[PDB]
Ligand binder design. Structure first.
Ligand SMILES: Cc1cc(CCCOc2c(C)cc(-c3noc(C(F)(F)F)n3)cc2C)on1
Ligand SMILES: Cc1cc(CCCOc2c(C)cc(-c3noc(C(F)(F)F)n3)cc2C)on1
Lengths: 239, 40, 297, 243, 297, 243, 239, 49, 40
């Protein structure tokens, strides 16, 4: 064991050499729904390798004035691969997520990201009574941006976001963060299109900087999410 | 607890459960951190 | 997972100059909180701490009776030229967000499973009219009727929806002790959710609001004065108190900082200046090197 | 019948009473219990979780600027870099923390605190800091010679990016009070101060102005008593549906 | 006959292509309901259902307290030139049909055997006169007297039939908790009948009405204000609530669709248009192929 | 005497309370118990009995016309014949059923439903239908290619005159709500649709326009909770003796 | 066992070849009143063969617009055979009924009847407060017609009539229905002339039809009722 | 003290209730029982005459 | 059940009887229907 990690799910394999650890959210690993907790009586489809694999989303440019980014699960993966098709074709879904955030910079660069898995992250809007529109909330694989990262866009605090399963990417120590998410719902399964269990948020707490010849460096942030123990019930036409 | 009624949910405040597992939130890491050890 | 009835004891510690052992250094990047003990950061004495923890149990922290509803209607003859509607009642649409102390305290967790003890506290005042001689508050009979989701609501004091043949209702007078009952854990799911990152309708229309949970549709409380109208106008104020019992709590949240604005969403305006402003939660001090309450001698 | 005398406290509603009550839904079957991860049994579990402090709570920092402390290379020696008030009850860096917010729901508190500082400069940037906890009695130290005489830790930057200082439980009384009078013997915890031990040294290729993020949590010897309505949240009217 | 505390569990099922086995086909002509299991109609998983059934017990379904009587008389001096009759009381003629919620719920069975808990809820209002100054509701003593079949009924408040030496009577005041007692199963037969396909008289005359049962002649409830008349007019409203206990139920009926019109028979007029019209019980939709609440995206 | 404190809930009348009360007729001997056939112990026994659905709830059918679906020989293929809304709370074919009327006395429900269709044409008339239960999420299917992708049964007419389709319990929550909002996630069950698999074929001697009668019942995995006053029955005044 | 049935009570024997089954109302068979349930102390007369036998009533023409027919028991048999005489001569009666409805049509004909045994069927009249007259209620062996079969002439529903012991005659499957009725009363015996325990109802749910040369076909409906375990108490003059 | 809730039927006088009550003449010695012929235990004995 | 009064009919709601026999109403047929079998 060390600062090195290889994650292997189906076709996919990710390696990192500047890791910290694996954050198992609430010290739990995702598992398939047992019979004692089962509600939907139809036999579920458990596609292991075709769905439980790393889906890499589009990267984001870390800027000096970057407020931060969020991706809502499963919305981020609902129009991607066989996870998307099984979502489009089924009423109910259940899955955990292995999230892996990647950011490479030099030993001369400075900057820190908080990577937070927030359960049931209800976005609050500043300076209005009107609740957030479908467009603002459901952005899919492109994800959304933080307007008020200080308040977690919730009227809460970034300060107290460390209750939530989290890691840091401190360019001194770390180029990659890894958070294992189990199923988080009051119900055993849910409708993927109209509810998100998790929100993976990447907030720059300390800004990206360099010295004299390392300013304005192009530093992307890449997010790879692997569904874990994915189940689907209610086989119908595709929506 | 006492409960003078038929239903169990009608009972008073439940008997104190002093079980604590702060590791869920304080050390939720795959490989456990050893006290005094460099945790890299 | 261990039993903690009393806080941790302190063990006597000695001088330690050992290579390869750095208990005061941690890696915050792992997501793990510092594991450094006082015993290994400083030289400590033996302390046998007998401080109890029962008051910090979630049963004790949430299991106090809190106000969840305050409604006031005028108790009088509401009849006119052509109304025939007495209107000596109110309907609430059950929720736990109207009052911020219980809301912020409940909103410290994502999921809660609890049975709830309810206590209704009624109060009367004579309405200050042009010619009004006070001499005492009538011992009126009140009816609080829980109208579940999809049941017919009352439109008047004299309505027959008040039958309550199957609707749970409680009859209680003014000069009696405040009405009390326990509602069970009554969610369609295994826990109540204080936040819903999603929609409660299958349609994608504006009318389908973000944050509304399809398990918080809990029906309505309809409360009436059973007594027919008095010759004078009274104002009945009803206070409903909620005490969670047999509580299970999951996924602790970041506490609310900005003041609440409504019960339909968690939106905010913030206060004009610190504290609890959108750009400044903690009040300002002059500098990072300034102690505002510095003890001067 | 059963011989009966109604005592004082009869016909009273106490908001902290513990009695069984009439079930409104007789023989109601509640939804079967289902396992959800992250179950909290005690508020003492949450105060043990690290949370960032607004050390930079100044009228020039906005939003995320307030949660980081700008550490720079000094053209001087032994100089004070930043202070931390330990008045949880008063508007200070510890207020908007998991410790602060949840302890602020109580009146009495006892136990040792941990404060962890993460250095967020360059891998090539080096430095030695001295963070000191001064127990109460007199003024906050402004010279390193005075601060070093109290409980302190010397911080060498390196592969381990963070340092903890244990603010140990040092009080005459078994408990302290979250009192509006900061200068009260019942309330005052003392001072935390950070000085340069050597300096911050960064090569030309690396930025000279780095940042430190401060976190605070409670240890396992931590206790709270006498629950109260938090002053964090206020209300002028019943919250409407819209406005 | 088996014990069912929780609903049936679901067993895991496999693919089945077997000749001579057609579990999805039934013969409705036998009068038997389909016996097709989900396990044998689709591919199912193992589900251990812990949903309780205690709330669907006929004891729970019927054993709630329902309103069965609402009567209001004026409490005043009714005396005139030559009356000498005080008239500060009412007589009900016991029944369970005046209020539709308990009637329709009881009428879901042919026969019921239950002991009944009764609760009487009185309420006063000052009568709005030309010159009326309110200052509080007198704590009046009320007397509810059960007058069985063939006993002398009271003709006045001041009558001596109120002796109640052998007639069951309860004395209860306004500011006290509502009066309560249990009446036993008191039918001449082994069960109460909600419907009587026959006549209660031996004669064949029009006066002998169809549907009247010769076991529903249950006598009368006579309720009086025991206090002599006040100097001002009060209106006493009495509400009687019925809670069936120790219930046995037989021969479940088709539920009532049309609104009730009287307590002597089960006749109907129906509503002008659907729903619950004589020719249309369920509301109209455009076509058999039209979804009225179709989810559009 | 016995030391006594009257608590909150003293002097209250709760319509769902479970207490013994004073017997009005002391030492009264009730009529001896006699065996009557068809004794009901649970409302779950009645919802398990089949009851006809108003599938033809249209503003051209009157009385018994509303309980039968006119099935005819088609000059087309794969066409939709009829739909069934599954909104028990809303005015639909399932409302005036034993399932509907008795479930409508409750707020929450869970379990699988059975819907049996009896063909009532001629012995000489043949046909194949496909009845499909679409779980919720999107629009009701209008093409057989879309409907076949959901839970369905293909129905061959013959000596066994009826077919059952099990509407299986497929929901995220342990219970659904009888809510006035049909399009709510808490309430929506989805859709039942019937298409022609082949066609209806009748010889000249037999009528071309046949009928189907639909019945619906609950299975043994069916549950109801949170009793309420049914909206089926209303009242504007105390029901008089005559009028 | 099969789709064929022979019913034999006393002199009588009915055979059918297009049967479905025998419906035993509430899964019970009629039996004689036991001593533990006995009230009337006089020794009862139990005439087996002379009363417990199939009485065939007058047939009814099934029309395209037929609303349906009902027969109230024992009123239907109170002026027929030795069952009638024992009724006329006694105060009290107790009996079950084996009801057998018959309807023959071709394999080319279509139509469906619901045959319902309704206990204590109190007839509700549409558009009046006046309760049904003796004439309207007591029609004897001739029986009565449904004005509102949709409402079971009760302000109830035909839809929910399947609670009651019932069979169907679907001309595809079935030409005969058979329902065994046990004693249904809150009392052990009753007065036959002024109360009916049962109402046998025949409602056309799907109308009688044929194709081009099978229209306007004469299709009667025949009802045969056999009293089962008949008892009589209170021997007096005939009424 | 003993935890107490006054139910419906509290403070009511029912003429058919069966409860013990306060003795007005404490330690009162009633006249010794003496045999009298024709003792009636049931009203059903009189209707048989 | 508890009952503070002399008569048994004065007692509270009777102890839950969970006995169910829906066959009385769902399969009231002389010859029982076998599951999966053609019931003709
Ligand atoms: C979110 C969330 C919502 C809840 C449950 C709140 C309980 O809601 C009530 C309240 C406050 C009062 C009554 C009530 N008050 O009186 C009556 C009665 F009279 F009908 F019995 N019912 C019923 C319910 C379900 O818990 N978490
Ligand atoms: C049909 C049918 C009828 C019944 C019994 C109804 C109970 O009737 C009552 C009612 C509602 C009240 C009283 C009553 N209320 O008060 C008194 C008392 F004061 F006399 F005790 N008696 C007595 C009876 C028999 O059950 N099924």
């Amino acid at each position: 064991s060390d600062r090195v990690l290889q994650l292997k799910l189906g076709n996919s394999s990710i390696v990192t050499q500047e890791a910290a650890n694996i954050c198992c959210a609430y010290g739990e690993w995702p598992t398939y729904l047992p019979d004692n907790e089962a509600v939907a009586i139809d036999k579920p489809t458990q596609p292991e390798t075709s769905t439980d694999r790393f889906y890499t989303l589009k990267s984001k440019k870390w800027e000096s004035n970057s407020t931060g980014w969020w991706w809502k699960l499963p919305d981020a993966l609902n129009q991607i691969g066989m996870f998307g098709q099984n979502v489009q074709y089924h009423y109910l879904y259940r899955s955990g997520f292995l999230c892996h955030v990647q950011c490479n910079a030099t030993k001369f660069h400075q900057g820190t990201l908080l990577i937070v898995a927030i359960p049931e992250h209800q976005i609050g809007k500043k300076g209005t009574g009107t609740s957030a529109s479908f467009a603002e909330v459901m952005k899919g694989a492109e994800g959304g941006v933080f307007e008020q990262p200080y308040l977690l866009d919730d009227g809460t605090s970034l300060a107290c976001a460390l209750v939530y399963p989290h890691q840091w990417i401190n360019l001194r120590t770390n180029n990659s963060a890894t958070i294992v998410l189990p199923w988080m719902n009051s119900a055993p399964m849910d409708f993927a299109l109209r509810h998100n269990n998790w929100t993976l948020a990447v907030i720059p707490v300390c800004p990206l900087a360099g010295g004299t010849g390392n300013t304005n460096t192009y530093v992307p942030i890449t997010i790879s999410i692997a569904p874990m123990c994915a189940e689907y019930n209610g086989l119908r036409n595709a929506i | 607890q006492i409960n003078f009624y038929k239903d169990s949910y009608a009972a008073s405040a439940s008997k104190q459960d002093f079980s604590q597992d702060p590791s869920k939130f304080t050390e939720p890491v795959a490989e456990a951190l050893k006290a005094g050890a460099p945790v890299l | 997972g261990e039993i903690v009835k009393t806080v941790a004891n302190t063990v006597e510690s000695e001088i330690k100059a050992e290579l390869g052992v750095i208990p005061s250094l941690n890696a915050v990047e792992t997501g793990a909180t510092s594991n450094t003990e006082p015993e290994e950061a400083i030289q400590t004495r033996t302390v046998i701490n007998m401080h109890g923890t029962a008051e910090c149990l979630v049963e004790n922290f949430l299991g106090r009776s809190a106000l969840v509803c305050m409604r006031s209607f005028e108790y009088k003859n509401h009849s006119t030229s052509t109304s025939s509607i007495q209107k000596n009642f109110f309907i609430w649409t059950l929720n736990t967000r109207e009052l911020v102390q219980i809301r912020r305290k409940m909103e410290l967790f994502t999921y809660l499973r609890f049975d709830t003890e309810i206590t209704i506290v009624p109060t009367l005042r004579l309405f200050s009219s042009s010619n009004v001689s006070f001499s005492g508050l009538p011992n009126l009979t009140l009816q609080a009727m829980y109208v579940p989701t999809g049941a017919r609501k009352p439109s008047s004091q004299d309505s027959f929806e008040w039958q309550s043949a199957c609707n749970p209702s409680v009859f209680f007078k003014i000069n009696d002790p405040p009405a009390r009952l326990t509602i069970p854990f009554m969610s369609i799911n295994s826990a109540y959710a204080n936040f819903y990152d999603g929609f409660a309708g299958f349609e994608k229309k504006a009318t389908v609001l973000y944050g509304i949970n399809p398990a918080n549709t809990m029906g309505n409380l309809c409360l009436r004065v059973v007594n027919s109208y008095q010759p004078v106008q009274y104002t009945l104020t009803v206070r409903v108190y909620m005490k969670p019992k047999h509580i299970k709590a999951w996924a602790p949240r970041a506490p609310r900082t900005m003041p609440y604005t409504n019960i339909l969403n968690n939106n905010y305006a913030g206060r004009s200046a610190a504290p609890n402003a959108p750009t400044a939660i903690v009040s300002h001090r002059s500098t990072i090197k300034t102690m505002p309450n510095d003890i001067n001698l | 019948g059963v011989p009966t005398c109604l005592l004082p406290g009869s016909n009273q509603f106490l908001t902290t009473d513990d009695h069984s009550s009439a079930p409104a839904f007789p023989d109601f079957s509640p939804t079967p219990e289902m396992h959800i991860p992250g179950q909290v049994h005690s508020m003492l579990e949450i105060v043990q979780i690290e949370s960032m402090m607004e050390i930079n709570n100044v009228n020039d920092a906005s939003g995320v600027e307030r949660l980081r402390v700008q550490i720079s290379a000094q053209s001087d020696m032994d100089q004070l870099l930043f202070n931390i008030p330990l008045d949880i009850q008063l508007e200070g860096p510890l207020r908007n923390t998991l410790l602060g917010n949840i302890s602020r729901y109580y009146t009495h508190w006892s136990g040792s605190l941990e404060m962890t500082f993460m250095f967020c400069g360059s891998f090539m940037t080096t430095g030695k800091l001295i963070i000191c906890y001064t127990p109460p009695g007199g003024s906050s130290p402004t010279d390193r010679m005075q601060a070093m005489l109290a409980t302190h830790v010397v911080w060498d930057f390196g592969l381990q990016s963070s340092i903890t200082i244990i603010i140990p439980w040092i009080s005459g009384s078994h408990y302290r009070m979250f009192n509006t009078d900061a200068k009260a013997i019942n309330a005052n915890v003392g001072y935390v101060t950070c000085f340069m031990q050597t300096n911050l040294v960064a090569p030309v290729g690396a930025a000279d102005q780095c940042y430190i993020v401060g976190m605070v949590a409670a240890k396992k010897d931590f206790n709270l008593r006498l629950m109260r309505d938090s002053p964090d949240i206020g209300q002028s009217a019943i919250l409407p549906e819209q406005a």
